[PDB]
Write a protein that binds this ligand. Structure first.
Ligand SMILES: [Cl-]
Length: 419
């Protein structure tokens, strides 16, 4: 008794109208633009041409809402326009519901998946290296459900925050840091979005717990940098092998988000020097680069992951860090780890099927990855790792494609994961 096209669209239209959440508020406002600089300023982040963008968007309608997919601070609305042309309106919000990102783009098309070959043939894009790895975790080891290039080390962007989380948990267990310990935002520690903590004023005091929460749930770069500063680079590097990484040297020096941004898209000479240097020279360069960021979001574009300016790991490294975090969570009887890991599942999840879902995304120019750990109410866990890398960012896009492939795999779990 699957809903028919007409039923599906009506359900989405009503859900959008009824949604009494920050995403509902923002999506309805955005849809209103489609169907006043002072009111725009009040709806966007404080540090937010737009009237012209809205004019161009409006010229593509009239629009009909066909699907509505809110997920905490992120949301997508599928729109049909004249002649059956479809678009997706994407929203990303800050912590109080102000709009950070609002885009209207051609629809991303992902079929319902019947077989793993459907996944591979949908995903494959000339010029893009990709990898799909799916396993069932058991007492007796991992059962491989599907694998394409899991052994290939690839850049993974904010997947690295999973390793930072395991390092943090290890220090909590050793008693060198506490969940309620205070970290302090300084001008030097501020990074770029993703995240919201960069929007806090200088001197803002925040607990380790709340910083780690934002580091994971919002992929907060500033949160991650505060944690990495508190632990120290050497402590994080020493934690990598035990945390699950097969070859820690691939991620040494272990970069902060601030360092990736500043090195990757700042001074071209400094970046060339990085390429020429060994680990010692790279550490020395990073120390000299310490200070307040000069690079801004508009500077990003060119790919630099090929120069080692990212965080490289294989699919097996991602499975091990997620399984390790599952173990870390169970050991932490306070539920602090679990609360952090489950806050944002990246999708609308069937909670009657899945007791817990861990999720992490990562992206950089030419880099996209999504991973989930899903555990059912009987205690059976699955891990799904999706990765793309390319020399040209336009071959990958904003990540709705790879995320959507994950969504369809999870929707078809009875066929692809738990058959
Ligand atoms: Cl995401």
């Amino acid at each position: 008794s699957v809903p028919t096209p007409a039923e599906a669209a009506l359900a989405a239209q009503t859900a959008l109208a009824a949604d009494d959440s920050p995403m509902g508020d923002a999506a309805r406002w955005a849809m209103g633009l489609l169907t006043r600089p002072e009111d725009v300023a009040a709806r966007f982040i404080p540090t937010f041409n737009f009237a012209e963008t809205v004019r161009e968007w409006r010229s593509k309608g009239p629009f009909t809402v066909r699907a509505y997919h809110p997920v905490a601070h992120k949301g997508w609305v599928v729109l049909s326009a004249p002649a059956g042309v479809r678009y997706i309106l994407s929203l990303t919000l800050d912590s109080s519901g102000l709009i950070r990102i609002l885009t209207l783009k051609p629809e991303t098309v992902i079929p319902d998946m019947v077989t793993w070959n459907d996944v591979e043939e949908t995903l494959h894009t000339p010029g893009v290296q990709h990898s799909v790895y799916a396993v069932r975790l058991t007492p007796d080891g991992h059962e491989v459900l599907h694998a394409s290039a899991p052994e290939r080390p690839m850049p993974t962007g904010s997947a690295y925050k999973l390793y930072l989380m395991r390092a943090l948990v290890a220090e909590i267990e050793k008693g060198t840091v506490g969940w309620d310990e205070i970290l302090t935002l300084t001008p030097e520690l501020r990074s770029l979005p993703t995240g919201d903590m960069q929007d806090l004023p200088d001197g803002t005091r925040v607990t380790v717990r709340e910083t780690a929460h934002k580091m994971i749930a919002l992929s907060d770069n500033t949160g991650a940098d505060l944690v990495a500063d508190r632990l120290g680079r050497e402590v994080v590097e020493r934690s990598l092998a035990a945390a699950g990484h097969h070859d820690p040297s691939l991620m040494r020096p272990f970069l902060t988000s601030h360092e990736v941004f500043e090195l990757g898209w700042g001074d071209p000479e400094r970046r060339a020097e990085w390429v020429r240097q060994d680990e010692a020279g790279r550490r020395e360069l990073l120390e000299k680069m310490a200070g307040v960021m000069t690079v801004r979001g508009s500077d990003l574009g060119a790919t630099v992951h090929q120069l080692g300016i990212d965080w490289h790991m294989d699919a097996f490294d991602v499975v091990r860090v997620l399984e390790g975090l599952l173990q870390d969570s169970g050991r932490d009887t306070s539920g602090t780890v679990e609360e952090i890991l489950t806050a944002y599942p990246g999708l609308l999840i069937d909670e009657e099927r899945w007791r817990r879902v861990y999720f992490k995304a990562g992206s950089s120019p030419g880099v996209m990855m999504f991973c989930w750990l899903l555990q059912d109410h009987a205690g059976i866990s699955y891990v799904l790792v999706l990765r793309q890398s390319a020399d040209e960012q336009r071959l990958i896009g904003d990540g709705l494609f790879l995320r959507g492939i994950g969504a369809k795999i999870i929707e078809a779990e009875a066929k692809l994961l738990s058959s």
